[PDB]
Amino acid sequence: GYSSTQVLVRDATANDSRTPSIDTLDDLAQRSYDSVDFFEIMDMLDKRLNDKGKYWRHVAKSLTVLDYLVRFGSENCVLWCRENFYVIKTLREFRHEDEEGFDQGQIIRVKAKELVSLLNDEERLREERSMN
Ligand SMILES: [Cl-]
Secondary structure (H helix, E strand, C coil), rough: CCCCHHHHHHHHHHCCCCCHHHHHHHHHHHCCCCHHHHHHHHHHHHHHHHHCHHHHHHHHHHHHHHHHHHCCCCHHHHHHHHHHHHHHHHHHHHHCCCCCECCHHHHHHHHHHHHHHHHHHHHHHHHHHHHH
């Protein structure tokens, strides 16, 4: 019941130890230029960026994807971040301490802050996107 693109975003953001690979990130960035794929990718990222707690890997990996898209995918990816800027900004405050006491949330907060900073700096983002 998944499109090819939906399988790819699901895998890229799964609750597992794998980090999204460069090949997958590039595939997603290239596919983001096709409108139908763009919406499928962003709808799944929306779901996963809004996860929490024990499922923080969904959030962290979706931020990894979203940053890659902002840098290398279609301009629509940037527009999406601006429309949904509130969600990204709240991730700066994401918390989760695991059973063994480790702060797993800090990685999400740092990533969110970096992305907020990039989105807030139009000239830097335009330059980054141009060289990419
Ligand atoms: Cl398909």
